Amino acid sequence: KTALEMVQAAGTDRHCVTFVLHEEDHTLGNSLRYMIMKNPEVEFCGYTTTHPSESKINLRIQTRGTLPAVEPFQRGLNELMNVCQHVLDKFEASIKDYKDQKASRNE
Amino acid sequence: DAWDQDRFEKNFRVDVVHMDENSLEFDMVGIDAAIANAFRRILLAEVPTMAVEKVLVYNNTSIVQDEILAHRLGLIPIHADPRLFEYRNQGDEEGTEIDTLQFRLQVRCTRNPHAAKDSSDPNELYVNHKVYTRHMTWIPLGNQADLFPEGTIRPVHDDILIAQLRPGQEIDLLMHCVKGIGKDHAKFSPVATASYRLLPDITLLEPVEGEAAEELSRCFSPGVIEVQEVQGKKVARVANPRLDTFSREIFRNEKLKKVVRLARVRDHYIFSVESTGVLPPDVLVSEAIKVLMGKCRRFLDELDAVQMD
Amino acid sequence: MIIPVRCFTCGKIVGNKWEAYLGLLQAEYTEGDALDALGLKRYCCRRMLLAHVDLIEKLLNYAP
Amino acid sequence: IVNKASWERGFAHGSVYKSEFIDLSEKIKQGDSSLVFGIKPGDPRVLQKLDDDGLPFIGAKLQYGDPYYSYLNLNTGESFVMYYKSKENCVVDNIKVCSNDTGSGKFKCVCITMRVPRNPTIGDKF
Amino acid sequence: QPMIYICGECHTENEIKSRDPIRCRECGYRIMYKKRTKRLVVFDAR
Numbered sequence: 001k002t003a004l005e006m007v008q009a010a011g012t013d014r015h016c017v018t019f020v021l022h023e024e025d026h027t028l029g030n031s032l033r034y035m036i037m038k039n040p041e042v043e044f045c046g047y048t049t050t051h052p053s054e055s056k057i058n059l060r061i062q063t064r065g066t067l068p069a070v071e072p073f074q075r076g077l078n079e080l081m082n083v084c085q086h087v088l089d090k091f092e093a094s095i096k097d098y099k100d101q102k103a104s105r106n107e
Numbered sequence: 108d109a110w111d112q113d114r115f116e117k118n119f120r121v122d123v124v125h126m127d128e129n130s131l132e133f134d135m136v137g138i139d140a141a142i143a144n145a146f147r148r149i150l151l152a153e154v155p156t157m158a159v160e161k162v163l164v165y166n167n168t169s170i171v172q173d174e175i176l177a178h179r180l181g182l183i184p185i186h187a188d189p190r191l192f193e194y195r196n197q198g199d200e201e202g203t204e205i206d207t208l209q210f211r212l213q214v215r216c217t218r219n220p221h222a223a224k225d226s227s228d229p230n231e232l233y234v235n236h237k238v239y240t241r242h243m244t245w246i247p248l249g250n251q252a253d254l255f256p257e258g259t260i261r262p263v264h265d266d267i268l269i270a271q272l273r274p275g276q277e278i279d280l281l282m283h284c285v286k287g288i289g290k291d292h293a294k295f296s297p298v299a300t301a302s303y304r305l306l307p308d309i310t311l312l313e314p315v316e317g318e319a320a321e322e323l324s325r326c327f328s329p330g331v332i333e334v335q336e337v338q339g340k341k342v343a344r345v346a347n348p349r350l351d352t353f354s355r356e357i358f359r360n361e362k363l364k365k366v367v368r369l370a371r372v373r374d375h376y377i378f379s380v381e382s383t384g385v386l387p388p389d390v391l392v393s394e395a396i397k398v399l400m401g402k403c404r405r406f407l408d409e410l411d412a413v414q415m416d
Numbered sequence: 417m418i419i420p421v422r423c424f425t426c427g428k429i430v431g432n433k434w435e436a437y438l439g440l441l442q443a444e445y446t447e448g449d450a451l452d453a454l455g456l457k458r459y460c461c462r463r464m465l466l467a468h469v470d471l472i473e474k475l476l477n478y479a480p
Numbered sequence: 481i482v483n484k485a486s487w488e489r490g491f492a493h494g495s496v497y498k499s500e501f502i503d504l505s506e507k508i509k510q511g512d513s514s515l516v517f518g519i520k521p522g523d524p525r526v527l528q529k530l531d532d533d534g535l536p537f538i539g540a541k542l543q544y545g546d547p548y549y550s551y552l553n554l555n556t557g558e559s560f561v562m563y564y565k566s567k568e569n570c571v572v573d574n575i576k577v578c579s580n581d582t583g584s585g586k587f588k589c590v591c592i593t594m595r596v597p598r599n600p601t602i603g604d605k606f
Numbered sequence: 607q608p609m610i611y612i613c614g615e616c617h618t619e620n621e622i623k624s625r626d627p628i629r630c631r632e633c634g635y636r637i638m639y640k641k642r643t644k645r646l647v648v649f650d651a652r
């Protein structure tokens with residue numbers, strides 16, 4: 001029933017942890033890989049699908065300057081919500097500018 | 108540099124080009140490929156729709172086989188709103204009011220009695236000989252007649268040739284529409300094709316005149332490069348480089364491959380979403396943006412469930 | 417045998433474009449314009465209707 | 481590599497028609513050769529799976545372990561049963577009842593024809 | 607009703623009980639098919 005496994009590297013090392021996200025593919029795994037790499041506190045962030053017969057991804061996040069690597073991953077997700085929310089708000093308010101120019105043009 | 112959220116909300120803009128029914132074309136300045144590809148790949152496989160899953164036959168006396176008819180009915184778009192309905196919990200053969208829809212394709216072919224003199228045309232000899240999808244009767248169950256008016260739950264295209272009959276032959280089946288995402292099977296996808304392309308730029312590094320401009324005018328697509336007269340000579344200027352197919356034809360001519368710099372404009376994608384008709388196309392792009400947020404919220408809920416702290 | 421409902425490559429509904437394709441071809445259109453004027457733009461869809469041998473009129477001759 | 485959605489929409493879908501001429505004298509020979517197809521009333525093995533003549537229905541799907549036909553020894557009354565011992569799943573397309581070359585043969589020859597779907601799977605050579 | 611069988615040529619619904627010789631009772635033809643009746647078989651649309 002679970003959907004996320006955190007795997008520490010050497011037990012004590014919480015700087016490197018490979019988030020194994022269940023029921024995924026390169027849709028969120030590549031959008032997250034773009035957002036976590038936009039953090040200067042992240043030395044390395046790469047993902048891979050495990051095997052295409054499976055539907056889970058690996059997502060390595062490893063940081064510098066002593067941050068636990070779930071804080072660039074919470075910031076990795078919320079800063080994608082804030083991007084899709086703004087894309088949604090500039091899309092639904094640009095369709096309406098198109099509908100209300102198709103209406104009030106020669107009708 | 109890092110993700111300045113106010114650099115994004117200043118440079119992003121969507122410019123809708125064409126939107127009639129069952130089509131949409133819009134631009135996206137300033138989004139990167141790892142988000143635009145996520146929108147494209149959520150349109151093709153994540154936005155859920157309704158489609159036929161079980162088929163309960165009685166007397167398929169037709170030529171189209173019992174298996175191929177069920178597969179052919181699976182690929183017919185149902186004009187039900189997917190957001191009203193739920194997923195079926197596994198193992199239920201008869202779903203409830205909320206899970207499933209029903210239909211009934213009950214067609215019998217017979218000869219035309221009258222006006223059948225010296226003719227071999229099938230429309231004049233036979234009645235019900237081309238089983239179209241306008242022969243499907245929606246059979247609402249529970250209280251589904253009250254949620255939807257007369258004429259909402261319906262096949263979309265009502266011209267799709269399902270079978271083809273001769274007299275004596277009958278099709279008496281019963282269907283069960285379910286809900287699913289477009290990657291469990293391809294019959295659930297809402298979109299014909301959803302794609303993008305970068306806006307090309309074309310930069311005349313040298314002013315070309317005369318007949319070399321007409322030779323340039325035909326290397327690109329019709330409408331990209333325009334030839335204008337300026338005092339006896341015909342000089343070429345680009346005009347709307349969106350039209351270009353990016354076919355690299357100018358890099359075959361020798362003297363003119365070193366005057367234009369055919370490249371692409373970064374992060375200026377031109378989408379196009381063509382719906383199959385189950386939902387309008389600007390509602391499919393909205394419920395494709397809103398799926399990536401749900402994929403973020405589910406993992407934020409899992410992080411809240413792991414660490415209480 | 418019979419025209420597929422969806423195009424194989426990208427799933428445009430092309431099953432509702434067969435009788436109106438024969439109707440354009442009997443009205444002296446060419447096949448480069450009877451695939452243009454039905455709204456088939458990509459050559460993966462124009463493949464599906466141009467190259468289709470409707471093999472069910474020959475198959476229904478063997479009727480009871 | 482074949483596209484998955486294109487495979488799902490109908491790309492090179494097929495069928496293979498395993499037909500099987502069943503004769504009750506060239507195969508099943510014990511005594512007097514009075515074997516007609518039939519079900520004995522009160523046999524739970526043929527309930528809703530085989531028809532009232534001992535042959536399966538047309539359109540009825542068959543799987544490994546289904547009753548395939550049943551034949552009624554006319555002299556004793558003891559009907560037998562033969563089971564579908566193939567691995568694949570198949571649908572009975574039509575059943576033709578063959579007589580002899582005179583026209584007076586008893587109801588003991590039959591030729592069941594079965595559709596088997598056989599879509600492209602992994603390992604099918606193009 | 608008894609089972610119904612259709613001749614190959616003249617297409618007459620000739621019922622055959624399992625005793626008498628098998629032939630069409632109009633034109634004497636020797637190969638006889640079988641009629642398809644109502645019963646429920648569930649096929650999935652996948």
Ligand SMILES: [Zn+2]
Nearest residue numbers: 423426460461
């Ligand atoms: Zn296509």
Ligand SMILES: [Zn+2]
Nearest residue numbers: 613616630633
């Ligand atoms: Zn006959």
